[PDB]
Amino acid sequence: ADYQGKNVVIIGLGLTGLSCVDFFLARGVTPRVMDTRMTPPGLDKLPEAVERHTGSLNDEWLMAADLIVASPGIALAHPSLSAAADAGIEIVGDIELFCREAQAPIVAITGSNGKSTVTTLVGEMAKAAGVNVGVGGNIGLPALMLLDDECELYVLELSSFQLETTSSLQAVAATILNVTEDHMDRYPFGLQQYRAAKLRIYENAKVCVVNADDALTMPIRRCVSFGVNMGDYHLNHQQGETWLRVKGEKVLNVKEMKLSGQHNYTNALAALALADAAGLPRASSLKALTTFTGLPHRFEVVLEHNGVRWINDSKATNVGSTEAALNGLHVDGTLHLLLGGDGKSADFSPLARYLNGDNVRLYCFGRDGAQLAALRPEVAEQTETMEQAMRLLAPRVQPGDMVLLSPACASLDQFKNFEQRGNEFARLAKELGSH
Ligand SMILES: N#Cc1ccc(COc2ccc3cc(S(=O)(=O)N[C@H]4CC[C@@H](C(=O)O)C[C@H]4C(=O)O)ccc3c2)c(F)c1
Numbered sequence: 001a002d003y004q005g006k007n008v009v010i011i012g013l014g015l016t017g018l019s020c021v022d023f024f025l026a027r028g029v030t031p032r033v034m035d036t037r038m039t040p041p042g043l044d045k046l047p048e049a050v051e052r053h054t055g056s057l058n059d060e061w062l063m064a065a066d067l068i069v070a071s072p073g074i075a076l077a078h079p080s081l082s083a084a085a086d087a088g089i090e091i092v093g094d095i096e097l098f099c100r101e102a103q104a105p106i107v108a109i110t111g112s113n114g115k116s117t118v119t120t121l122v123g124e125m126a127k128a129a130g131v132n133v134g135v136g137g138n139i140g141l142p143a144l145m146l147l148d149d150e151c152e153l154y155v156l157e158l159s160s161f162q163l164e165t166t167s168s169l170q171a172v173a174a175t176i177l178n179v180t181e182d183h184m185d186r187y188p189f190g191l192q193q194y195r196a197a198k199l200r201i202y203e204n205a206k207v208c209v210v211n212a213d214d215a216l217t218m219p220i221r222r223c224v225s226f227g228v229n230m231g232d233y234h235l236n237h238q239q240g241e242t243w244l245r246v247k248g249e250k251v252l253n254v255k256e257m258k259l260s261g262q263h264n265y266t267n268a269l270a271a272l273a274l275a276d277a278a279g280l281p282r283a284s285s286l287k288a289l290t291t292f293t294g295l296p297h298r299f300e301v302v303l304e305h306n307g308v309r310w311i312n313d314s315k316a317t318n319v320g321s322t323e324a325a326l327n328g329l330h331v332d333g334t335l336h337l338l339l340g341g342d343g344k345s346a347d348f349s350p351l352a353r354y355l356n357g358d359n360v361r362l363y364c365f366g367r368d369g370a371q372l373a374a375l376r377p378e379v380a381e382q383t384e385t386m387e388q389a390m391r392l393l394a395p396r397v398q399p400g401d402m403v404l405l406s407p408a409c410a411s412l413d414q415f416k417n418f419e420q421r422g423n424e425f426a427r428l429a430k431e432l433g434s435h
């Protein structure tokens, strides 16, 4: 693509918007930047030569543009963007800009749950093969920060929002891991509209990897599949042991993995299918499955002391992810479950089936705390903040108990990001969980 001479407007700053600014400047194009936030992150890092408009959108700038580069954090359906689209003004995002430039194959991963774990695992599979790999997207670096002539493979985590603005992805291997209700605040035509955004990832993919157990992951109209009891890649249970299999052949006894739990085993299958499709050697891919320890904030034991396990699952930002933490969970004593934040208009009802019995207490906070407490009011407490919830539950914790932050919500109503929520939980767990 050639941007020389174009009037380019970037909506959204932060590290990603900065990477877009830097991308254009390095190509001799000075873009303009706008952000609905008065003081967005990275503002002090924006060179003064770049004009900026903050605190609102500027329709004079948008309607004047030759190209609008929209952060995934702004809806295409925003009236100002729909007006520009109606006028024939091209709108793309950073992932589109990246795909037009990339000179190595791309493995592309989306889904409601599991996408960071699978992206990271395929990255580690590539590293173990000695491949020069760039891993990022919706995690790690913004994708444009990965671009490098020496890179031999890119592995991108892509969100539904990024996919809505991307048209030139031709992945060597692409997956939707699963589709469960999320982001309803951004999808007023509901689950199928969200699904449609993720289905874009398969367009012009060489290999599509689908979840045999989740029909919403399949194109509307020749994919490789993974699943539990069925799929090209599947699990084989042998007498209190589980194996990863490919078409009937055992490839790994999961006792060799550091990750545990069925959904992490299907994550491993999906990662293997993608790596296989990308041409990585099977042996080194399997080795990476044995070395990978997990991501921070993803069902992470932050303290195990005095008979109590404190688990930071701050990355559980939707109902499906909390369900994955709760389904089959073993707790000797009482589960003290922290829920709360911005639930993005989700129905939390599917969680209620895990919340019966005498051994569960809920501590509900943030914007949607009241809705969460309503799952089972008899065992629920509501506070404004997560710190208040922790200070309330800690005196009640007994040897054998579990304290689980798996909040089913985004963090942005009260936190910078889910990592800050997790770090704050870990600090408080260490304070409250020893004498
Ligand atoms: N104009 C403008 C403008 C343009 C961009 C931004 C910010 O850049 C983004 C880019 C993506 C965004 C995505 C969401 S989200 O509702 O999908 N929430 C997710 C990202 C934050 C995560 C966290 O809690 O750390 C949770 C996550 C999720 O999936 O819930 C929410 C806000 C997001 C903001 C912005 F704040 C303003």
Ligand SMILES: [Cl-]
Residues within 6 Å of the ligand: 356, 357, 358, 359
């Ligand atoms: Cl029980």
